[PDB]
Amino acid sequence: PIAKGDHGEGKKGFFGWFNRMFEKSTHHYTDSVGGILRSTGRYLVLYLI
């Protein structure tokens, strides 16, 4: 059973750090995709390449 909203960010040493930096990474990646979504056809040219 996992508590609602528990991402294990604040517990122990390595696993906690890993989860923090991971959610951080995924967030940066949502901003990344949400950033490239603004441009519909540069990565398309790259794709055809």
Phi/psi at 20 (nearest 5 deg)?
Answer: -60, -55
Per the document, the length of the chain is 49
- Residue appearing with tokens 């390449």: 49
Q: Can you read off the two tokens belonging to residue 7? A: 């991402």
Residues 6+ apart with CB under 8 A from 20: 9
Q: Can you read off the two tokens belonging to residue 39? A: 């441009």
Locate breaks in the chain with C to N over 2.5 A; list the residue preceding each.
none
- Residue appearing with tokens 């122990």: 12
Contact yes or no for 15/8 (Cβ under 8 A): yes
